[PDB]
Symmetry: D2
Subunit: 295 residues, 4 copies
């Protein structure tokens, strides 16, 4: 036997940083959950009980907190890149650092019309995420995402003209509910290293905000033929609005809202055009995935 | 042995309802999770396998969807009173209906600063809840709540002057993070019946909104001496502003954000006034409860 | 406005304790999650920002770990009584201690049919719980429970003879799947104090085990007329077998397994006696409660 | 823009099947949760709103239930292979079927020493899983796994001789707790198709049981130098005991149990050799991964 692949590190590292403006007295908060996994010349830690090649997961945890102290935590693309670079540079035998970040929402409260200087609400479980793979002499590969964006539209969704055979029961429809939890990833062009990441810093927040606007606007306005057709329109406009994106990936669940036949009870009419009351289905769900790139 | 208490019914009944304005074409969506438990002459269903006294959990489920077809699902104080009253009136041998409702957020999307007619977003897992006990001959007891309202403030929270003995390690502080998930319940004056609930329907939405505003404002603005002192301020404001409330109850966790000492590392300074990066604590957590009434 | 009720303390305190037999070298592990809330002369901590009456949640946390160092953590009825009694005795102005404990399973591994001295497995998320209310001058109220015991039987469950009206669709059945997650509580006779709890310590483990055996056996063997009729049989057995119990309480969901009609497909037969493949239903679920006492 | 990758299907399909022995009256239950995602000539469903290339997710759901009716659901390697083959054969334009299965535990109850014919307990949340990728003219790729196997050992775990620098605080130790949730995957040699899968059916259950025995026994007996060293020993013996396995992958969290310094309180001694009471850490956690193959 031999080790073909190995990586280890600290998962589920919860971090908070506050910026306090001395000038304005205005405070700003950042909260995230970090995972750092390292690869390199570490096989003997598995094969020969040789811990001398291990940067302890505890020290990795320490390093996440120290990097946050000494560097920006935003945009998360940058923080991830700084943190992964530290590890391949500090340690000769470490050749890759995989950094995953979930950003939690802390939105400034508006109190009596006025933005508050140090109060915040979690206005969604919606996350902003990054996966930063820092690979010595191969560069930095960044995937940026939003996840847990939960949306529903009460009409202007259709599903008909699908294949029918001896396995098919689904009624064609021209008016239905469509609800999803959006997971959307944009894969950046390979970066040569930390310098190139720093060179594109302003694109990260701007690209995330645009991904979010295009998702919300397309969903709200498209008379959806299908989840497939609508998610594709989303990816195309995102690609068009950022040349540094190579691919856009949507993973979208179809969270069914079933019509309820109540006609067995006093001939109550609650289907097709009379559909008022529905049974949200917890499971199963449709799951539709698509990766879109440039021709 | 004898039955001292019994109740049975259907839990976790997912309901959606849409209103479609014919003139405007504006659609409005409502989603909730319902539980109904019945009491009454049912002893023998337990003691003697006499199913003749059971309204089947399935039928209670059917009745929830039918009631929603025939009645407004908002405010949930009303919907819950209607549904409870149905069972004790319909069935001679049923004497009490316990109706629990969790309302899920579907906030109308603004697209290009214009409110969309039929697209919605879940802005937070914040719930509005009701517990409605309809008891034949005693009337209707309604508790209304907001839960899962998650907030943080970065400063203007303190905790000093607490008891100190051989069990105390906690340092006094004049500046700390305060974070919580708000559980806030208002217990209404008993209602004589459905009619009286109906007659007060304009109070339910208004009281829930002022409950929310008072929670958000007081938390934002109070230079908190303690969770205890800040939550008492909220309760007494809500009481002062709605005379049909008998009691207000806060249940608030203290979601700790621990300072990190980094002085062991290159003399890095990250405590007291230098405190920038914190470790949010998943567990344990302070739990602070208070029921406030009229003197 | 005035405070009608208050309690505060630390929730979600994870504790592990190991016993190491010096002679044998057999180790035994205990893991639990603890919550302690105190009442007493604390009103002013809420009304007047008088922290002088607060035993800090942090100190309550420290006291939990210290009590565990100095005392046995089993049975949890005892541990909870010790911990509660500490607070009302230590502090003049504290008059009640509410102690909630969840015990996690660490079952000793058998390796080659030999019980291992220091290796353990979590066999199920089944918990043993206690709720211990220590009230100065009134004594100690203990509720003991098992929860998260998940069971299914494929036959020897029925449900026919239930009420039928314009709200009923459910077909009568003489053969069905019954599945549940058992929540079962036994309420002990009030105790005068810690001494009396101590004097009964051999009853706590034995009653929990016979509670478990009676649940498992009765469920396995009863040709169930209903959840109602089967859960009443369990309660009355446990009562008959422990005279210091005042009441037994089951809370049982009916986790439905729906027949699937496949006759639309190549005349496939999968209902009544042919019923082979079912669709387990996540929601909704029957919820059936019963408190049984002595006549 | 163009579609570079696409797959769609039904996730979270809950299935139950019962075998009833006419001879012995003995019943046996199987429960699982299935996901099927298809690829093929389906790009126009995304680019041209062309649903005519879509086997509806609803029909996929129907097909899962019908396959379960007409075929064995065990071993899950086989069921997955039958179900994925159906889709690439039935539909000319479908070229791959990705099938994921979680198997839930239903263990026969022992009542009074005797195995019960139709009663079952969920004796762990431990799962058995498969990923079956059926790719037209490339064959069948099976990954088998157990997950959610939670274990703890109170001693016979070590961690010393790790790298120390300006980032290191972790104390070396020669006696510590080690707890994990085991996720273990064995990747089978590529199969030419369904026929070859059927040819190896007896290896699937036998290989899973051996993976589980080797995990439990190695964990219990190894005086662990590290998670790395111990998980490697597990993979080697698994590879040695099944030639049809190409690789073994462990993903193991290190679920820290922290010592508690209580010496500040009456000089209480609870560290090193006096360590009795510990604080289980919810987060962060070490995460150690390794893929082992043949030299
Ligand atoms: O078993 C261990 N492996 C590691 O890599 C590690 N790092 N800190 N503690 C650890 N324990
Ligand atoms: O009532 C139903 N509505 C649906 O939309 C559906 N889809 N599959 N089965 C279904 N049943
Ligand atoms: O056991 C049962 N009890 C009930 O009250 C019930 N109602 N529907 N199905 C049921 N099954
Ligand atoms: O770092 C810490 N911060 C705190 O607020 C605290 N309270 N107890 N222990 C603590 N440690
Ligand atoms: O606001 C607080 N209230 C308390 O009771 C407490 N105890 N420790 N920290 C605390 N903070
Ligand atoms: O398929 C079903 N099985 C059931 O047991 C049931 N009860 N109500 N509706 C049902 N549908
Ligand atoms: O939008 C949809 N896409 C699908 O592929 C599908 N299948 N059933 N319903 C569906 N809805
Ligand atoms: O008290 C501690 N024990 C540990 O094992 C540890 N590891 N990192 N920090 C730690 N603190
Ligand atoms: Ar942060
Ligand atoms: Ar969509
Ligand atoms: Ar609703
Ligand atoms: Ar507060
Ligand atoms: Ar414990
Ligand atoms: Ar039962
Ligand atoms: Ar199954
Ligand atoms: Ar291990
Ligand atoms: Na390096
Ligand atoms: Na009645
Ligand atoms: Na006292
Ligand atoms: Na094909």
């Amino acid at each position: 036997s031999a080790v073909k692949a190995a990586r280890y590190g600290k998962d589920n590292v919860r971090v908070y940083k506050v910026h306090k403006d001395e000038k304005t007295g205005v405070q700003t908060v950042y909260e995230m959950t970090v995972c750092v996994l390292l690869e390199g010349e570490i096989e003997t830690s598995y094969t020969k009980a040789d811990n001398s090649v291990i940067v302890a997961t505890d020290s990795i945890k320490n390093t996440i907190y120290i990097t946050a102290k000494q560097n920006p935590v935003t945009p998360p693309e940058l923080f991830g890149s700084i943190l992964g670079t530290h590890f391949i540079e500090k340690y000769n035998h470490i050749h890759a650092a995989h950094v995953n970040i979930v950003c939690h929402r802390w939105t400034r409260m508006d109190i009596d019309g006025k933005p508050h200087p140090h109060s915040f609400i979690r206005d969604s479980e919606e996350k902003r995420n990054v996966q930063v793979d820092v690979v010595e002499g191969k560069g930095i590969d960044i995937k940026s995402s939003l996840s847990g964006l939960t949306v529903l539209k009460s009409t202007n969704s259709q599903f008909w003209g699908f294949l029918r055979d001896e396995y098919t029961t689904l009624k064609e429809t021209w008016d239905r509910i469509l609800s999803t939890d959006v997971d959307a990833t944009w894969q950046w062009k390979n970066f040569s290293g930390l310098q190139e990441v720093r060179s594109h810093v302003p694109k990260f927040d701007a690209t995330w905000a645009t991904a979010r606007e295009v998702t919300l606007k397309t969903f709200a306005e498209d008379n959806s033929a299908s989840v497939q057709a609508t998610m594709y329109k989303m990816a195309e406009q995102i690609l068009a609005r950022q040349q540094l994106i190579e691919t856009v990936e949507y993973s979208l669940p179809n969270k069914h809202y079933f019509e309820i036949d109540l006609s067995w009870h006093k001939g109550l009419q609650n289907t097709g055009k009379n559909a008022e009351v529905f049974a949200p289905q917890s499971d199963p769900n449709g799951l539709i995935k698509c990766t879109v790139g440039r021709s």
